[PDB]
Amino acid sequence: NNYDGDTVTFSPTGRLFQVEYALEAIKQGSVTVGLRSNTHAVLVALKRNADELSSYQKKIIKCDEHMGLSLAGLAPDARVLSNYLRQQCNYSSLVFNRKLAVERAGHLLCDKAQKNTQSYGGRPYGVGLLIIGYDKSGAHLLEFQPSGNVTELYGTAIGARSQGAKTYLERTLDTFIKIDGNPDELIKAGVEAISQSLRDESLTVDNLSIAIVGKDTPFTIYDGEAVAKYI
Amino acid sequence: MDIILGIRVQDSVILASSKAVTRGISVLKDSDDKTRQLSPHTLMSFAGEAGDTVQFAEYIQANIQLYSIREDYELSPQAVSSFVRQELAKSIRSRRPYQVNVLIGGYDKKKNKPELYQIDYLGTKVELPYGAHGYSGFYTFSLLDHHYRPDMTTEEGLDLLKLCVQELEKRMPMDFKGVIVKIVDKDGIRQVDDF
Amino acid sequence: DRGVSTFSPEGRLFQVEYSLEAIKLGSTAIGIATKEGVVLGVEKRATSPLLESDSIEKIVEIDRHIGCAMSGLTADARSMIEHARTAAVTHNLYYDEDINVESLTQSVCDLALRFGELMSRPFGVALLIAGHDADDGYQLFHAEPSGTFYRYNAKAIGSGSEGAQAELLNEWHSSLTLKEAELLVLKILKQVMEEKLDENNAQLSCITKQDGFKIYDNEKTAELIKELKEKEAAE
Amino acid sequence: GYDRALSIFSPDGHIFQVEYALEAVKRGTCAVGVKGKNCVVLGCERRSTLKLQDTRITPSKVSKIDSHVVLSFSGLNADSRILIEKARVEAQSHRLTLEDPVTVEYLTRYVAGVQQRYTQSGGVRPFGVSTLIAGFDPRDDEPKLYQTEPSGIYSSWSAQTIGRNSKTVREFLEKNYDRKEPPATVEECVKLTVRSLLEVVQTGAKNIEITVVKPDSDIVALSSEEINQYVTQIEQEKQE
Amino acid sequence: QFNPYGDNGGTILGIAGEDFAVLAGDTRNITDYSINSRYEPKVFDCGDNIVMSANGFAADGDALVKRFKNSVKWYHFDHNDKKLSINSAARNIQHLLYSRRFFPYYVYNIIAGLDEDGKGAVYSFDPVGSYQREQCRAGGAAASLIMPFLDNQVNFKNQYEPGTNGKVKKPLKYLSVEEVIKLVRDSFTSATERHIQVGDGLEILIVTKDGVRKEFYELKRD
Amino acid sequence: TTTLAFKFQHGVIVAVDSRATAGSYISSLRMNKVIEINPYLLGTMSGCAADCQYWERLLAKECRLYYLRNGERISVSAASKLLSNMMLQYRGMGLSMGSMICGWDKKGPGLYYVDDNGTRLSGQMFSTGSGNTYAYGVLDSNYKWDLSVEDALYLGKRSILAAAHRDAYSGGSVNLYHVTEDGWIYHGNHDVGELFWKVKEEEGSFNNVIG
Amino acid sequence: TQQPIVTGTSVISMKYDNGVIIAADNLGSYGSLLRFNGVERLIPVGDNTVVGISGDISDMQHIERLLKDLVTENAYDNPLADAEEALEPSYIFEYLATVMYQRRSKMNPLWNAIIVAGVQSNGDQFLRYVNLLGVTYSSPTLATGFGAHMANPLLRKVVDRESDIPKTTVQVAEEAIVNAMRVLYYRDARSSRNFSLAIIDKNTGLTFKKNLQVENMKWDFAKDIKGYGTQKI
Amino acid sequence: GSRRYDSRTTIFSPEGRLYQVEYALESISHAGTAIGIMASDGIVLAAERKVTSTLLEQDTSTEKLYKLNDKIAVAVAGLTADAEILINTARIHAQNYLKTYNEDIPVEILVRRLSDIKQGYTQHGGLRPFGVSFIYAGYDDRYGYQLYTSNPSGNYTGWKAISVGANTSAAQTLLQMDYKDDMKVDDAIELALKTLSKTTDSSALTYDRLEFATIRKGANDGEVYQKIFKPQEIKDILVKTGIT
Ligand SMILES: *[C@@](C)(CO)[C@](*)(O)[C@H](Cc1ccccc1)NC(=O)[C@H](Cc1c[nH]c2ccccc12)NC(=O)[C@@H](C)NC(=O)CN1CCOCC1
Ligand SMILES: [Mg+2]
Numbered sequence A: 001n002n003y004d005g006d007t008v009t010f011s012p013t014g015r016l017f018q019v020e021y022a023l024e025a026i027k028q029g030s031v032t033v034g035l036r037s038n039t040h041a042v043l044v045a046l047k048r049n050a051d052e053l054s055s056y057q058k059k060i061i062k063c064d065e066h067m068g069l070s071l072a073g074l075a076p077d078a079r080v081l082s083n084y085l086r087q088q089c090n091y092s093s094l095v096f097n098r099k100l101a102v103e104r105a106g107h108l109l110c111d112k113a114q115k116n117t118q119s120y121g122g123r124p125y126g127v128g129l130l131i132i133g134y135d136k137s138g139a140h141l142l143e144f145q146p147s148g149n150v151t152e153l154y155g156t157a158i159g160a161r162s163q164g165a166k167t168y169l170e171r172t173l174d175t176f177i178k179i180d181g182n183p184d185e186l187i188k189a190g191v192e193a194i195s196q197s198l199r200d201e202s203l204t205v206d207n208l209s210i211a212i213v214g215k216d217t218p219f220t221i222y223d224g225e226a227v228a229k230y231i
Numbered sequence B: 001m002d003i004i005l006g007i008r009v010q011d012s013v014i015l016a017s018s019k020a021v022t023r024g025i026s027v028l029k030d031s032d033d034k035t036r037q038l039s040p041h042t043l044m045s046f047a048g049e050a051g052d053t054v055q056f057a058e059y060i061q062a063n064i065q066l067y068s069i070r071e072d073y074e075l076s077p078q079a080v081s082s083f084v085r086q087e088l089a090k091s092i093r094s095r096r097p098y099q100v101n102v103l104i105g106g107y108d109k110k111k112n113k114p115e116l117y118q119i120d121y122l123g124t125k126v127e128l129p130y131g132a133h134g135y136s137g138f139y140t141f142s143l144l145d146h147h148y149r150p151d152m153t154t155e156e157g158l159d160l161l162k163l164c165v166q167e168l169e170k171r172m173p174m175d176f177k178g179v180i181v182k183i184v185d186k187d188g189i190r191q192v193d194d195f
Numbered sequence C: 001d002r003g004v005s006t007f008s009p010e011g012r013l014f015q016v017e018y019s020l021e022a023i024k025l026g027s028t029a030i031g032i033a034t035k036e037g038v039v040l041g042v043e044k045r046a047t048s049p050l051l052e053s054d055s056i057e058k059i060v061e062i063d064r065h066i067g068c069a070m071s072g073l074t075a076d077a078r079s080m081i082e083h084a085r086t087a088a089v090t091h092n093l094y095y096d097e098d099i100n101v102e103s104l105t106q107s108v109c110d111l112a113l114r115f116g117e118l119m120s121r122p123f124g125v126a127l128l129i130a131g132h133d134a135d136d137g138y139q140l141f142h143a144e145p146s147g148t149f150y151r152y153n154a155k156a157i158g159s160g161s162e163g164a165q166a167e168l169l170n171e172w173h174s175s176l177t178l179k180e181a182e183l184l185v186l187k188i189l190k191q192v193m194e195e196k197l198d199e200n201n202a203q204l205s206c207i208t209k210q211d212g213f214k215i216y217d218n219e220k221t222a223e224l225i226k227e228l229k230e231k232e233a234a235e
Numbered sequence D: 001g002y003d004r005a006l007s008i009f010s011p012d013g014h015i016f017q018v019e020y021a022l023e024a025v026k027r028g029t030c031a032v033g034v035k036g037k038n039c040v041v042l043g044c045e046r047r048s049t050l051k052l053q054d055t056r057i058t059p060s061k062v063s064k065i066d067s068h069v070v071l072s073f074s075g076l077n078a079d080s081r082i083l084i085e086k087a088r089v090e091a092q093s094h095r096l097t098l099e100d101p102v103t104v105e106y107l108t109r110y111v112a113g114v115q116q117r118y119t120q121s122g123g124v125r126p127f128g129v130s131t132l133i134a135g136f137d138p139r140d141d142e143p144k145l146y147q148t149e150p151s152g153i154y155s156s157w158s159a160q161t162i163g164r165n166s167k168t169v170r171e172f173l174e175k176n177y178d179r180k181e182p183p184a185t186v187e188e189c190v191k192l193t194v195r196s197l198l199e200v201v202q203t204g205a206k207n208i209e210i211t212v213v214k215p216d217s218d219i220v221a222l223s224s225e226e227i228n229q230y231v232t233q234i235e236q237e238k239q240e
Numbered sequence E: 001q002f003n004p005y006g007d008n009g010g011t012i013l014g015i016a017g018e019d020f021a022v023l024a025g026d027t028r029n030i031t032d033y034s035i036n037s038r039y040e041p042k043v044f045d046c047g048d049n050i051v052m053s054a055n056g057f058a059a060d061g062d063a064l065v066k067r068f069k070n071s072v073k074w075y076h077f078d079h080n081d082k083k084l085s086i087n088s089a090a091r092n093i094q095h096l097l098y099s100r101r102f103f104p105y106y107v108y109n110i111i112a113g114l115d116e117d118g119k120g121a122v123y124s125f126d127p128v129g130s131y132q133r134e135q136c137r138a139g140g141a142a143a144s145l146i147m148p149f150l151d152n153q154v155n156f157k158n159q160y161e162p163g164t165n166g167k168v169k170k171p172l173k174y175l176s177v178e179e180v181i182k183l184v185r186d187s188f189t190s191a192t193e194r195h196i197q198v199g200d201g202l203e204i205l206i207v208t209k210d211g212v213r214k215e216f217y218e219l220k221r222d
Numbered sequence F: 001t002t003t004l005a006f007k008f009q010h011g012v013i014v015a016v017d018s019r020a021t022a023g024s025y026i027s028s029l030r031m032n033k034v035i036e037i038n039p040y041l042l043g044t045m046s047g048c049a050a051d052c053q054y055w056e057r058l059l060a061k062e063c064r065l066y067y068l069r070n071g072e073r074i075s076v077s078a079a080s081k082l083l084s085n086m087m088l089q090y091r092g093m094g095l096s097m098g099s100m101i102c103g104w105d106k107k108g109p110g111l112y113y114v115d116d117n118g119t120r121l122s123g124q125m126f127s128t129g130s131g132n133t134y135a136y137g138v139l140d141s142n143y144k145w146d147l148s149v150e151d152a153l154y155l156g157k158r159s160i161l162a163a164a165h166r167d168a169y170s171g172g173s174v175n176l177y178h179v180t181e182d183g184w185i186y187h188g189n190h191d192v193g194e195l196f197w198k199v200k201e202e203e204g205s206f207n208n209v210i211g
Numbered sequence G: 001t002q003q004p005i006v007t008g009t010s011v012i013s014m015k016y017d018n019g020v021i022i023a024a025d026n027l028g029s030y031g032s033l034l035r036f037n038g039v040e041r042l043i044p045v046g047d048n049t050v051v052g053i054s055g056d057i058s059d060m061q062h063i064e065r066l067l068k069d070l071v072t073e074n075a076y077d078n079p080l081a082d083a084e085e086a087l088e089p090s091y092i093f094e095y096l097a098t099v100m101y102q103r104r105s106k107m108n109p110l111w112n113a114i115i116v117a118g119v120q121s122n123g124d125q126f127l128r129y130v131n132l133l134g135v136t137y138s139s140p141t142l143a144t145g146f147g148a149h150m151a152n153p154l155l156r157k158v159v160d161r162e163s164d165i166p167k168t169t170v171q172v173a174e175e176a177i178v179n180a181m182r183v184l185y186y187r188d189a190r191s192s193r194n195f196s197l198a199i200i201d202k203n204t205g206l207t208f209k210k211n212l213q214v215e216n217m218k219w220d221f222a223k224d225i226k227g228y229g230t231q232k233i
Numbered sequence H: 001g002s003r004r005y006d007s008r009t010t011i012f013s014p015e016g017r018l019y020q021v022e023y024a025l026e027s028i029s030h031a032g033t034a035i036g037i038m039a040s041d042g043i044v045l046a047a048e049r050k051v052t053s054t055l056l057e058q059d060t061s062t063e064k065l066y067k068l069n070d071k072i073a074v075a076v077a078g079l080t081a082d083a084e085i086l087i088n089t090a091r092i093h094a095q096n097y098l099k100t101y102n103e104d105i106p107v108e109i110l111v112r113r114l115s116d117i118k119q120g121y122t123q124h125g126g127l128r129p130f131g132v133s134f135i136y137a138g139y140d141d142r143y144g145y146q147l148y149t150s151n152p153s154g155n156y157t158g159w160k161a162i163s164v165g166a167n168t169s170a171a172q173t174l175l176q177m178d179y180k181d182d183m184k185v186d187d188a189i190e191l192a193l194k195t196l197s198k199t200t201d202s203s204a205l206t207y208d209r210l211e212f213a214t215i216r217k218g219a220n221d222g223e224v225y226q227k228i229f230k231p232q233e234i235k236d237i238l239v240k241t242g243i244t
């Protein structure tokens, strides 16, 4: 109200409204789902178009051979943050000959987002990210919020109507975690999960976007007729 | 570059400058004009290190032309020469000084007098009836000391200038490929096409 | 007052949303992509008859294989065009090749959100970036001040955009020829324009693989206008 | 440093600071530009509220940017000096780096760019100035006349006016100026420029300034008596 | 006084076939009269069907290769996983080298692969960035030993057709990959004999449309 | 190297050798020392190969940007000046470059010499490189404005040959160009080895050499 | 640009079937003065890596601190710091190599020659060299300074190529290293009798031996040597 | 943050005016009147000190008339402290020109420079403008005797006669009436004092409430002399013209 003019101002109840408004941008964004087993990690994203003449906005970005994310909210902010991750993954490889741990990647995103919430002039990031990866401690899935909060999860979903997919994963927890050494079945579970967040529209060939990473699988994105198999 | 001469007569200033440009052991050009018009009644000839000369001259030309447009007024030769001197005096203590020597020949329309200024790369300014830079003065100043009068005509000034070039052509080991001569008077700047 | 980079309660940047309103006031620009080329057309909209219309430059070359049309506060586009031209030629310097239309568009859109308290406000202009490369063929992009860019088969921006976009919705198909696309831009421009469309107050352009980006002459466009009139009168 | 964003968008998609700068231009004295077949004439209004003025030394309304290009304006006088200085510096900077004088179109594009930059830079306000830029490109006999404004947009004009009561003189020019046959001579071009100012000026004494620019850097400013002869001839024909 | 440069020896060789290319180099690394390693790889697969070797000062060589491999990675990120063509890689490397015009990478660089028409391609660089496409090139310590041999046995220089006596040249018939590898092996065996910094091992990288293949051969260890 | 270029009635001829050296070792037998900046602009190369390639390819970028901004080809005079200004930024930093910017513009055919010192000279005829003195000898005695395109191409070709013969650091092959108002025209790569024997027989020159 | 003041001499090392061995004497020389006699030049990093350093001791102590700080930094927000995400020899080396090359590129080098010896997660042997120029190389045997000239020849007789590594036992490898250290004591004027030796095995882990002495030295034959040519008494 | 407290000194009003410049001009209208009159053979500068005290040391006091160099002087109207900041800058600018070109700075060039500094404070920086209006009286060999004025907007104009400060409307009307082109310095002195005597808010115009100065070619042969009048000399010229 009087305490939402900038990010540097706490409300009387200890809330940061600009951060909460940035969180709101994520809820307006299109749905995306993340889930993992012990061998593989999968991202599934519902792409959004402007109209019938337009293309479908890309949702998934590659950060390294072993790491990538899906976005929901302001796409340019995802480009800035994914660029930062690319650089950090790359710094770890060039200097230490070491693939960046997914947990550490999350800690770096948290700290970068945090600086924008405590300083005058700037603004919080208006995007939420689901980071998947495979490192020395196996498969991982992270959820990033522009408040700074980063959370390691078995599965999750963000965006509009994301609660439906999140409930499904909460039921299926014991099943999909055990899907080891079977990428197609893990993607199926993800496609079935994101389907719980659909209304009116359904999953078409140029609508659906899928990405996967695992033990002997580099981060690869599937679009177009490559996802027709899963429709 | 090498030889640049100047002489101030009754009603004009005459500048003579060599045409040769050398690179390595080869004369690349024998028609080079080592001068820039700073204003309608002010001419500057130059000589020094390769590249620095033209860059400095054009930089000065741009500054004087800028002043002329801003004030709708031509600076006096004296004012121009002082500006040039300061730029060179500023330059000599820089990281990389500009190694350029100049003669500024101008006709002051206010005083109705020709004026010749000699400025070296250190910023050493002197007003003279006749001047030169480098080794040029070693050969020519004795002739000028002898023959020069302040009431000389432009034609007589050219004849005395021919005699100076003939002496240079005889006693210098250097082939400078003749000179381009330019006259600065009340009517402006013109080039003597046959010399 | 309030921050320039402030979020609204709905999760939108106030300034970005307000710049979009400025673009709605701009003159109409239309782009149509085909397999034979991409056509770009604009409404010139001279404020007075004494204004020499040929000086109105709302269609612009970025490279030989990339063209651009603008709508909104057209003065804001000059630095965007300058950056685009620099990016296009710089990539040619670094990689000895033409730059991808998408990559060029992405470079322009990176400028968009570089504002705060960098420039003091977002751009007040939208761009239709049309071009061709070997990888993805003939392409048409719509670059906004939000930093977002969508690819389009056909797109209209400016004051008559939503009316033109609905018309493009019906008319566009994947087998359109270049000649058909030219007449289609002229048709839709003539529809949404206030004044009567002629060769002096409207401008056409195209990008083909062979000839590259070309702005059409007034004599060439005049014939296409006369060809349009006759074919509409044919039924 | 002072970084405050002064020029910003409003809910309806307007930049008020840029629009208020146009109001400063509206307040400024009238300036007019007319191009003939082989010349361009720049007319300027001088408000007669200020007498006891020294016309020798008072800043003239038309300013030479180079020997072949001139610039007149309407709006804040102090703001116009900054643009003129920058333009003059750029004109010499172009000659120095490219070895050709600026084209009229290039000089206009630069001045317009400066005006635009001051609409999306922190800590600064827009120029309260619109300019008319006229001249002839080097080794070209085609007349050139451009206009700029605070937003940074620019365009070419057969004839144009800016400043206070510009709406009226533009009305006059739109009906009197024929594109198929423009003022063939200098006389006809000046006559039309004076006529257009006489619609607004008040008295035709020291209130009208005229500057004729011809090809090949031939720029002259008319005197009071020369202009007064045009004023006399116009009204004598009008008495009929 | 500190000397930031050093010489790690070695020699490299690139040959462009009709539909293939090879980049070979010895595996010996040295300082002065000592051997550091008998097997220290010098020719690298940089991705996109491009091989590269920066011969001279190993620290600068490793840094340049590392930076180009990085340049390939960022080319994929920035331009939608587009394949970096050999000509584009060459121009990119020029700019990497010239960025240190006033403190140069002390290396002679060669890359090899296939052009956009599928034909064999070899590009050669000097330490400051001048480059050019070629058919044949030896670089490094024994470069002057090997190049004349290749002018003779690859481009048939100073060879004419018997009977004509200098009137008709030997026609420039193309070479197979098996024929090229023979010339490479003989080139390095000969260089090993007369150059003290060449020996230990030979590693050859062969590039075809099918990918990048490796072949290793022992060399004299003295 | 040896490079030359000269103006004449039908435009400008441009001829260069193709040798590259690293000390006494011939590093390259065939290196291109001409750059096609645009269909109406050429640039010759002499000195440090790296410097020549980098700065002339950067000139092309800047010349290309000129066309996009102004919708018109850059003049030869302006292009040469941009290059000389680049050289003036790295004043005394050790750059080694000597080039001739050759082209056709509105003023007709244009030819400018530019070097690492910043020197910029307009002229009818120029020659750069270690073998420039040998080329000048042939050019000065046989040059006319009234030359035919055929005879002019031969003169530039023959002048490089003279230098390639005598100068140890010049040779390999001759690259010929002819600049017209419709643009430049490539007139091929000519091996000096073969060209020498051909010229010797047909012309009767090089009598002292046995063949 | 500087000059080395207090220096450490040769560092020698080799691979064997199950791991690597590395050794270096305990001397800190000040030119020709044998100034400091209790200097440790082998520095363990965790339980899987030993970094051996020769050259300037002040720069060695600086590197020693960088490594100590590297371990501290790796443990930050890292639950697997003593397991899967522990520091590897390859990580430690590449870090140092990056630092060395950067410092030489600023014309302000760390005046050292370094050998990083260890065993990776997968049991693979790691042995790589880096110096003040940023030059890196790997080999079955590695040695710095005088060791390169005298030790390598002896160690290469045991492991001449890659295929000899599985055939070499820890007892044979240690014996070769200890003999090399004796030879260096005979012939290097800037060396000492006292030295340290470290063994990093994939089975038995890190064994760090201190206060070792060169023994079984041959000097008796010196009594018979008289004069420099013609002298008999 | 800090934005909350920013007055925004450099913005347009909806009518296209600069708020702070207009308000600065309002400040200046309360300042003591200063008058400049240009004649064929010289220039007069007359100014009124504001409500003084008997205990003010007048002979060592200076609040209105300042010397920029030997050829150019200024009369001040507004904040004195603000004026001194600008005056010292102008003094330096004149010496920079003299050092560079070895000639005394032309009057207009000096005026333009100061006016450009004032202009800058209205367009950028976020600082308040200088609350000062100058009358420049000077001489050079190009245009001879010259009068200029500048105000906080940074706009400057040339004049035959001009007033700044309080009651300029009334003062300008009186000057416009009695001024003629063939006028001389002695006549201009009388006109300046008569105008102040009629426009003043004080009961009577006395020597202790005035600062006065002339720029005359009335110096021995072709040269110019600046005369800053002393208290006793102002008292004498008041008696001579018949005011006291
Ligand atoms: C004569 C041959 C002079 O020797 C020419 O000027 C020639 C000019 C030239 C220009 C562009 C491309 C090729 C050649 N210059 C050289 O060949 C030049 C001579 C040279 C060598 N060091 C120099 C230092 C300062 C000035 C000139 C120098 N040679 C080079 O620049 C060498 C280092 N470059 C190459 O040999 C280029 N290599 C690229 C990879 O392929 C093999 C050749
Ligand atoms: Mg001197």
Ligand SMILES: [Mg+2]
Binding pocket: E221, E222
């Ligand atoms: Mg040996």
